Design an enzyme around this catalytic site. Structure first.
Site, PDB file in Angstrom:
ATOM      1  N   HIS A  21     -10.859  -3.458   5.909  1.00 51.30           N
ATOM      2  CA  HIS A  21     -10.283  -2.175   6.143  1.00 51.30           C
ATOM      3  C   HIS A  21     -10.852  -1.181   4.879  1.00 51.30           C
ATOM      4  O   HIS A  21     -10.649  -0.096   4.794  1.00 51.30           O
ATOM      5  CB  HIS A  21      -8.901  -2.010   6.265  1.00 51.30           C
ATOM      6  CG  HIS A  21      -8.266  -1.120   7.444  1.00 51.30           C
ATOM      7  ND1 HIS A  21      -9.277  -0.756   8.356  1.00 51.30           N
ATOM      8  CD2 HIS A  21      -7.103  -0.594   7.532  1.00 51.30           C
ATOM      9  CE1 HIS A  21      -8.403  -0.149   9.287  1.00 51.30           C
ATOM     10  NE2 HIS A  21      -7.201   0.058   8.831  1.00 51.30           N
ATOM     11  N   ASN A  74      -2.745   4.826   5.626  1.00 59.95           N
ATOM     12  CA  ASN A  74      -1.849   5.464   6.607  1.00 59.95           C
ATOM     13  C   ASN A  74      -1.762   6.917   6.681  1.00 59.95           C
ATOM     14  O   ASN A  74      -1.478   7.908   7.566  1.00 59.95           O
ATOM     15  CB  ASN A  74      -0.648   4.673   7.198  1.00 59.95           C
ATOM     16  CG  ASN A  74      -0.303   4.453   8.472  1.00 59.95           C
ATOM     17  OD1 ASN A  74      -0.788   3.790   9.240  1.00 59.95           O
ATOM     18  ND2 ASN A  74       0.726   5.324   9.288  1.00 59.95           N
ATOM     19  N   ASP A 126     -14.424   0.952   9.014  1.00 65.32           N
ATOM     20  CA  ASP A 126     -14.776  -0.332   9.553  1.00 65.32           C
ATOM     21  C   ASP A 126     -14.422   0.140  10.995  1.00 65.32           C
ATOM     22  O   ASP A 126     -13.314   0.962  11.184  1.00 65.32           O
ATOM     23  CB  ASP A 126     -13.874  -1.239   8.923  1.00 65.32           C
ATOM     24  CG  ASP A 126     -12.527  -0.959   8.673  1.00 65.32           C
ATOM     25  OD1 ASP A 126     -11.932   0.217   8.008  1.00 65.32           O
ATOM     26  OD2 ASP A 126     -11.671  -1.502   9.689  1.00 65.32           O
ATOM     27  N   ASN A 143      -5.725   2.804  11.892  1.00 62.04           N
ATOM     28  CA  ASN A 143      -4.626   3.852  11.501  1.00 62.04           C
ATOM     29  C   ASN A 143      -5.002   4.659  10.521  1.00 62.04           C
ATOM     30  O   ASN A 143      -4.464   5.684  10.259  1.00 62.04           O
ATOM     31  CB  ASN A 143      -3.537   2.713  10.908  1.00 62.04           C
ATOM     32  CG  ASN A 143      -4.023   1.981   9.860  1.00 62.04           C
ATOM     33  OD1 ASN A 143      -4.911   1.169   9.742  1.00 62.04           O
ATOM     34  ND2 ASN A 143      -3.350   2.312   8.600  1.00 62.04           N
TER      35      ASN A 143
END
Length: 187
Positions: A22, A70, A95, A116
């Site tokens: 991520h 987030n 990603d 997210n």
């Protein structure tokens, strides 16, 4: 085109998160800043760190959020506004779960592929019409929470190739800046 670009890289801060799936947008953004002699300045006013640069003759503002994945959008929303950049002049590197490992695609709009971070940015910018430099990380293996797959470090097989996939990603980002989606070329 007397207008600047925002090149945002999505990631989580923290030493143990740096090399997780991520965090590719962070490395790719770290690479670009390095290529343009750009240094990451703590941007108190929005929250993210910011480097300024010049590529193919264009004004660049690079950015990496300093909170969790987030709420990227809660920091990229006010940042884009600050440097007064229209959402179409914002490129976001992340990603992609829907792209095979190693594949780099470029697109404006489209889905969010369960990321997210991208959703947080869509929410905070309202629209989902900003540009993306998508870096394939592949689908999770068998029974596996994707939200934990992306917080794991790349297998020793994969990480051999990550350095070269990011170089190619930074190169796609550069080429997107000089042309448009006349790129998505041999990119």
């Amino acid at each position: 085109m007397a207008e600047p670009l925002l090149v945002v890289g999505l990631g989580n801060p923290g030493a143990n998160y740096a090399r997780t799936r991520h965090n590719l947008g962070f490395v790719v953004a770290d690479l670009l800043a390095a290529r343009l002699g750009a240094k990451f300045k703590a941007h108190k006013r929005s929250g993210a760190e910011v480097a300024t640069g010049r590529s193919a003759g264009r004004s660049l503002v690079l950015a990496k959020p300093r909170c969790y994945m987030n709420e990227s959008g809660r920091q990229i929303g006010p940042l884009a506004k600050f440097y007064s950049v229209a959402p179409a002049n914002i490129i976001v590197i992340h990603d992609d779960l829907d792209l095979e490992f190693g594949r780099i695609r470029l697109k404006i709009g489209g889905g969010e592929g369960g990321h997210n971070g991208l959703r947080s940015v869509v929410a905070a910018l309202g629209t989902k019409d900003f540009q993306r430099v998508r870096i394939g990380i592949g689908r999770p293996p068998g029974r596996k929470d994707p939200a934990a797959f992306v917080l794991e470090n790349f297998t020793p097989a994969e990480r051999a190739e990550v350095p070269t996939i990011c170089e190619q990603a930074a190169d796609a980002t550069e080429l997107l800046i000089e042309q448009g989606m006349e790129p998505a070329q041999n990119r």
